[PDB]
Amino acid sequence: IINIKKEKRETDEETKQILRMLPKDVSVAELLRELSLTKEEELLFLQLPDTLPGQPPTQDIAENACTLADLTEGQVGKLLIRKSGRVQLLLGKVTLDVTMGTACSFLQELVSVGLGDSRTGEMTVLGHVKHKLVCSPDFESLLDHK
Amino acid sequence: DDPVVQEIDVYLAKSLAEKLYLFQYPVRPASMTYDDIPHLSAKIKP
Amino acid sequence: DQEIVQMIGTEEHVMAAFGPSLEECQKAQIFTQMQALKYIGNKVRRQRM
Amino acid sequence: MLLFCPGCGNGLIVEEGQRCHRFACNTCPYVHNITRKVTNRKYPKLKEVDDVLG
Ligand SMILES: [Zn+2]
């Protein structure tokens, strides 16, 4: 029997129903093992808030939503890992917090669909997505500040 | 609790802003991938 | 059906309880959205003409 | 147990082919022959030796 086309168990984390013979991680230890334990690159999928703490630069406006489509390239923020497991994102004067999202176990392929021509385009499989991050405003600090 | 280690920088790229899609298979576990499956075509609408 | 079972739950007792429903569904020839919609419409009565 | 086809995701039943018993789906030609023993225990609750009251 073919080994890469066996039947799959309902539990996606325990699909190994037949053999030839997971604790919930944290973002700080995740990045630590991604950089210290290994050096291989990894593709992440983080969810940013609706409005970023910035203004659309010369985008013809109004206090509207400021997403990544308005910001330019270059360094836009820093990622801080404090003690006791704190993982913050300093995006300027404010600091958000980054937590682990829903642990997806199904296949997630990050691909690039580039329509170079109006009749023929190219689909480029960039990689696979395994972990999901969630960035949230530190509302407690924003409230105690003013 | 000071930021002792891992002061990672965050960069932004706009090259594939309009060409980046996310395809997720709710019925296919992450263990088995479609890398070995020969694809034939893809229909799409802008 | 795998997506339905995932949506219901991944607990062993949940699958054991939901098994009869999947078996009864597989007894009939309902496997697409059109067939299920036709089966539902067959069970629909007009509001008195 | 409950098994599903990797192709379409429908439930798999157990039938008999031309060589051996196999799992098969009713909506696709996908099959899977059984090589070794497969079991699914449930471990039902054993009625306890009820105490004599009164
Ligand atoms: Zn199938």
Swiss-Prot record, chain A:
Location of the protein in the cell: Nucleus
Name of the molecule in the record: DNA-directed RNA polymerase III subunit RPC4
Subunit structure: Component of the RNA polymerase III complex consisting of 17 subunits: a ten-subunit horseshoe-shaped catalytic core composed of POLR3A/RPC1, POLR3B/RPC2, POLR1C/RPAC1, POLR1D/RPAC2, POLR3K/RPC10, POLR2E/RPABC1, POLR2F/RPABC2, POLR2H/RPABC3, POLR2K/RPABC4 and POLR2L/RPABC5; a mobile stalk composed of two subunits POLR3H/RPC8 and CRCP/RPC9, protruding from the core and functioning primarily in transcription initiation; and additional subunits homologous to general transcription factors of the RNA polymerase II machinery, POLR3C/RPC3-POLR3F/RPC6-POLR3G/RPC7 heterotrimer required for transcription initiation and POLR3D/RPC4-POLR3E/RPC5 heterodimer involved in both transcription initiation and termination.
Signal peptide positions on this chain: none
Protein's organism: Homo sapiens
Modifications the protein undergoes after translation, according to the UniProt entry: Sumoylation on Lys-5 can serve as a signal to mark misfolded Pol III for proteasomal degradation.
Cross-link (Glycyl lysine isopeptide (Lys-Gly) (interchain with G-Cter in SUMO2)): 5, 16, 146
Range within the parent protein: 137 to 396 of 398
Superkingdom to which the source organism belongs: Eukaryota
Family according to the record: Belongs to the eukaryotic RPC4/POLR3D RNA polymerase subunit family.
UniProtKB/Swiss-Prot annotation, chain B:
Coiled-coil annotated residue ranges, if any: none
Subcellular location: Nucleus
Superkingdom, taxonomy of origin: Eukaryota
Function of the molecule: DNA-dependent RNA polymerase catalyzes the transcription of DNA into RNA using the four ribonucleoside triphosphates as substrates. Specific peripheric component of RNA polymerase III (Pol III) which synthesizes small non-coding RNAs including 5S rRNA, snRNAs, tRNAs and miRNAs from at least 500 distinct genomic loci. Assembles with POLR3D/RPC4 forming a subcomplex that binds the Pol III core. Enables recruitment of Pol III at transcription initiation site and drives transcription initiation from both type 2 and type 3 DNA promoters.
Oligomeric form and interacting partners: Component of the RNA polymerase III complex consisting of at least 17 subunits: a ten-subunit horseshoe-shaped catalytic core composed of POLR3A/RPC1, POLR3B/RPC2, POLR1C/RPAC1, POLR1D/RPAC2, POLR3K/RPC10, POLR2E/RPABC1, POLR2F/RPABC2, POLR2H/RPABC3, POLR2K/RPABC4 and POLR2L/RPABC5; the stalk composed of two subunits POLR3H/RPC8 and CRCP/RPC9, forming a structural mobile part that protrudes out of the core and functions primarily in transcription initiation; and additional subunits homologous to general transcription factors of the RNA polymerase II machinery, POLR3D/RPC4-POLR3E/RPC5 heterodimer and POLR3/CRPC3-POLR3F/RPC6-POLR3G/RPC7 heterotrimer.
Organism: Homo sapiens (Human)
Designated gene of the protein: POLR3E
From Swiss-Prot, chain C:
Cell compartment(s), UniProt: Nucleus; Cytoplasm, Cytosol
Subunit-structure text: Component of the RNA polymerase III (Pol III) complex consisting of 17 subunits: a ten-subunit catalytic core composed of POLR3A/RPC1, POLR3B/RPC2, POLR1C/RPAC1, POLR1D/RPAC2, POLR3K/RPC10, POLR2E/RPABC1, POLR2F/RPABC2, POLR2H/RPABC3, POLR2K/RPABC4 and POLR2L/RPABC5; a mobile stalk composed of two subunits POLR3H/RPC8 and CRCP/RPC9, protruding from the core and functioning primarily in transcription initiation; and additional subunits homologous to general transcription factors of the RNA polymerase II machinery, POLR3C/RPC3-POLR3F/RPC6-POLR3G/RPC7 heterotrimer required for transcription initiation and POLR3D/RPC4-POLR3E/RPC5 heterodimer involved in both transcription initiation and termination.
Similarity field: Belongs to the RNA polymerase beta chain family.
Associated disease: Leukodystrophy, hypomyelinating, 8, with or without oligodontia and/or hypogonadotropic hypogonadism: An autosomal recessive neurodegenerative disorder characterized by early childhood onset of cerebellar ataxia and mild intellectual disabilities associated with diffuse hypomyelination apparent on brain MRI. Variable features include oligodontia and/or hypogonadotropic hypogonadism.
Protein name: DNA-directed RNA polymerase III subunit RPC2
Full-sequence portion shown in this chain: 248 to 296 of 1133
UniProtKB/Swiss-Prot annotation, chain D:
Positions bound to Zn(2+) 1: 5, 8, 25, 28
GO CC list: cytosol; nucleoplasm; RNA polymerase III complex
Entry GO MF terms: DNA-directed RNA polymerase activity; nucleic acid binding; zinc ion binding
Keyword Zinc-finger listed: yes
Gene Ontology biological process: defense response to virus; innate immune response; transcription by RNA polymerase III
Zinc finger (C4-type): 5-28
Location in or out of the cell: Nucleus
Known disease link: Leukodystrophy, hypomyelinating, 21: An autosomal recessive neurodegenerative disorder characterized by global developmental delay, loss of motor, speech and cognitive milestones in the first decades of life, and diffuse hypomyelination of the white matter and atrophy of the cerebellum and corpus callosum observed on brain imaging. Clinical features include nystagmus, ataxia, dystonia, and spasticity. Other more variable features are feeding difficulties, poor overall growth with microcephaly, optic atrophy, and seizures. The disorder is progressive and may lead to premature death.
Family classification: Belongs to the archaeal RpoM/eukaryotic RPA12/RPB9/RPC11 RNA polymerase family.
Name listed for the protein in its UniProt record: DNA-directed RNA polymerase III subunit RPC10
Protein source organism: Homo sapiens
Organism lineage string: Eukaryota, Metazoa, Chordata, Craniata, Vertebrata
Parent-protein residues present: 1 to 54 of 108
